[PDB]
Design a protein around this nucleic acid. Structure first.
Ligand SMILES: [Zn+2]
Lengths: 145, 48, 112, 49, 116, 102
RNA sequence: CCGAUAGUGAACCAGUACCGUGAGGGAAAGGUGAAAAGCACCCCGGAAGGGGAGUGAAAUAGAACCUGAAACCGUGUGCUUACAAGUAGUCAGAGCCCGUUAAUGGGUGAUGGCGUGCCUUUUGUAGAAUGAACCGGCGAGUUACGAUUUGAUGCAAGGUUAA
RNA sequence: AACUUGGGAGUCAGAACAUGGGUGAUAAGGUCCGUGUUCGAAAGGGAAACAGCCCAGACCACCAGCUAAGGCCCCAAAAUA
RNA sequence: CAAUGGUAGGAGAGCGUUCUAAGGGCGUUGAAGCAUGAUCGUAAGGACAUGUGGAGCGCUUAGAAGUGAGAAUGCCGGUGU
């Protein structure tokens, strides 16, 4: 228990990025955003403290699936009432509410602790090429590869 | 029909959160500077 | 300064005395006399002649001024229990507790 | 000898084993006897031959 | 002659109660239940000294990977370059440099990508 | 004012003025210890020794050769009558860095 | 040899309360102070109880009267807590509040990692197999004689006595 | 490390898995023998969790290194080689 | 240099509790018991400071045992839910 830096509040500096989902694959974009979102690209990554940045997934209406996942790839839920499953296909949740589609994909790639879901609240997804956060000075981030 | 575990002291003091009583209305009397219940007679030179 | 009064082994369960002490704790003694004689609970006549005895100890023994006296501390301690019985349906008895209380009331003029 | 610095011949005496007195003494619970059957009982055991 | 129990059982139970200081409710209070928690606490601490050594090494391999991709390098390609270049400073020290003096860290990545 | 010395089976990042806990050294209190194998010297003139710098040194003065804090080592298995309680207390040497010779 | 759960069932108005038609069964319960010097007198209250004054080294020594543990019940407060899925700890760790048997200190604890009580009985129990409501007391390989084997001591072709 | 004599024992309900076989139906987390492991009496890493499968045997400490089986998009160390 | 996971069991070394012998000590300028503390020893455990308490109690070597409790639908007290 010697010299090892540990970041904390009053030591953290969070930023804002814009990211375009125009031409990207759904789950291959979702996984770089979850690493930006969780503070694992910064040298001062501390596990018990919220590092990480804010991300604005700008477009979100042009995200792409591959194969037959437009009519395959059904999403299920239960109302907690008897016989209460409900389902929607991946291509229909893009024609209807294409922001919930990207929000639920990235959130399944974060932990389910109190900190893990304080971090998915730094996620803002928009269908269409405009965001209302122009006052936060968002930069631009490119997906590797 | 019968308790399966005993009740801890913590769980007992939470149930008793609402087992309390409130003070009465108890305004002051104009005839004698005193205290009486609202809408009742004064128990001290009974006036109303 | 402070003045004290106690009533030992008053035959009322300490759970029941405690509801009425939470009404006068921290009140001005002129307002707490009235709360106790305008309340319908069984311990109220007993608690207020512990309160009037503490105000009497304040003026006579300690030369205080009753106008600015306050209820500083009021509490009930468990006294010793009596053992009783109740006969039941088919030859068996069950236990009755006859529980008592020690009652303490401290008044203070709030100075140092 | 002095009557306050007595001492036995080295090797003549030795402390007795006291079984049934906990786990670290090596003979704690069952006290050397094992688990069940005729021989683990009080007085248990056929007699010789 | 008779030995009676007094003063020894209370002296040894009292020591266990003080090892249970700060436990929730009944287990900082009662002997039988407090003794059981101080046993699991002893056995938990045995593992956790072993496991501290994995946890700290795993979470400065995470910071050298982050600092090495700002010069467009992977972790496994940097740690292979510092091997065949000769440098033998441990992961605890490489990550304390990437935080404090990046000019000396980035001066070492260039020396590792010359060793391939 | 930035050196990396390999004392013990470990490595420390020293800085002129700083106290440092190390393993148990073979010196008495008051005297000075000089360490020969330093791997890195920062500042403005960086020197990355391949295994070592081959010509650098760090000198310290020893303080308070003592034993660590007391730690109990307890172990048991559940339904067997089997446990083990130990005590241990590890020695350390306290030192103060004086001068970093690059 | 015991020292008030011990020692007689009984240290005390014990073969007594009490139980049974009867024969019979059968308890619990010690301690003011050296000395009663056992709180005159005042104050609140119907009294009980109390606050002063006084006796005394001492009155929480005031007649349930030596000391006074735990479970349990309260009153005041330093830090904490109403988006959270808990065998309740442990390892890491900010912020705040303190200052020791003075030493790489003490209290709390945002958040992160890893974690299905104990005993018994079993091939195998987180077990939905057993036992324990909590705390305290006190509750199980003894010693008489004989045999055998080992250590240790005297003496040695001798060694040793019983009543 | 093997044998001899003497003091003290505990055990006589066993279980998966792989292979050679009987029985059963080339059924059973079946049953019964041969052989080898390891649980019993074995904690650690992998098979999500998971006595018996794979790897490997914990004297104590460390905010040091490199390897095993299994791994390297992120939950989650390590190639979006 | 080498060894040190462990149930049934075998073997070794110890810690603490009452009473006795001999020796030497401490106590109204406050013993034992009780409570609190951030102390010491590889463990069972040992001190020191303060508070309360009001008359006895440790240490060394040896001896002798009604000598150590968390479990028995255990026994008695008294306190919960
Ligand atoms: Zn009136």
């Amino acid at each position: 228990m010697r010299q090892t830096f540990m970041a904390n509040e009053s030591n953290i500096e969070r930023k804002w990025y814009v990211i375009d989902a125009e031409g990207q694959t759904l789950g291959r974009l979702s996984s770089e955003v979850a690493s930006i979102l969780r503070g694992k690209n910064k040298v001062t990554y501390t596990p018990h403290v919220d590092t990480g940045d804010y991300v604005i997934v700008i477009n979100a209406s042009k995200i792409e699936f591959t194969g037959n996942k437009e009519t395959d790839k059904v999403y299920y839920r239960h109302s907690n009432h008897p016989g209460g499953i409900k389902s929607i296909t991946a291509g229909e949740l893009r024609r209807t509410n294409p922001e919930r589609l990207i929000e639920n994909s990235i959130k399944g790639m974060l932990p389910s602790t109190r900190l893990g879901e304080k971090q998915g609240k730094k996620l803002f997804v928009y269908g269409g090429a405009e965001h209302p956060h122009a006052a936060q000075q968002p930069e631009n981030y490119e997906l590797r590869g | 029909a019968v308790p399966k575990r005993r009740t801890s002291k913590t769980r007992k003091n939470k149930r008793r959160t609402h087992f309390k009583i409130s003070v009465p209305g108890m305004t002051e009397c104009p005839n004698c500077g005193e205290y009486k219940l609202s809408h009742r007679v004064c128990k001290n030179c009974g006036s109303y | 300064m402070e003045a004290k009064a106690v009533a030992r082994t008053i035959r009322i369960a300490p759970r029941k005395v405690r509801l009425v002490l939470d009404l006068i704790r921290g009140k001005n003694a002129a307002e707490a006399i009235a709360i106790l004689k305008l309340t319908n609970k069984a311990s109220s006549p007993v608690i207020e002649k512990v309160l009037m005895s503490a105000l009497a100890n304040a003026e006579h023994n300690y030369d205080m001024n009753t106008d600015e006296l306050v209820v500083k501390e009021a509490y009930a301690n468990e006294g010793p229990t009596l053992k009783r019985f109740r006969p039941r349906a088919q030859g068996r008895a069950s236990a009755i507790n006859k529980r008592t209380s020690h009652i303490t009331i401290v008044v203070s003029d709030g100075k140092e | 000898m002095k009557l306050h610095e007595l001492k036995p011949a080295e090797g003549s005496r030795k402390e007795r084993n006291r079984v049934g007195r906990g786990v670290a003494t090596g003979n704690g619970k069952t006290s050397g006897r094992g688990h069940k059957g005729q021989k683990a009982r009080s007085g248990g055991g056929v007699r010789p031959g | 002659p008779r030995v009676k129990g007094g003063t020894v059982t209370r002296a040894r139970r009292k020591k266990t109660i003080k090892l249970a200081k700060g436990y929730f409710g009944s287990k900082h209070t009662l002997y039988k239940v407090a003794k059981q928690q101080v046993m699991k606490s002893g056995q938990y601490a045995f593992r956790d000294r072993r496991q501290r050594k994995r946890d700290f090494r795993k979470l400065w391999i995470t910071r050298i990977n982050a600092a090495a991709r700002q010069h467009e390098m992977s972790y496994s390609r940097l740690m292979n370059g510092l091997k065949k270049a000769g440098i033998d400073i441990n992961r605890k020290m490489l990550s304390e440099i990437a935080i404090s003096d990046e000019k000396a860290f980035a001066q070492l990545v260039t020396k590792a990508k010359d060793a391939l | 004012m930035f050196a990396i010395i390999e004392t013990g089976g470990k490595q420390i990042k020293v800085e002129e003025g700083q106290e440092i806990f190390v393993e148990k050294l073979d010196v008495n209190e008051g005297d000075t210890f000089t360490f020969d194998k330093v791997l890195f010297v920062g500042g403005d003139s960086v020197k990355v020794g391949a295994p070592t710098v081959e010509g650098a040194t760090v000198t310290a003065t020893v303080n308070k050769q003592g034993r660590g804090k007391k730690i109990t080592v307890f172990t048991y298995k559940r339904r067997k009558n089997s446990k083990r309680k130990k005590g241990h207390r590890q020695p350390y040497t306290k030192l103060t860095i004086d001068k970093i010779n690059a």
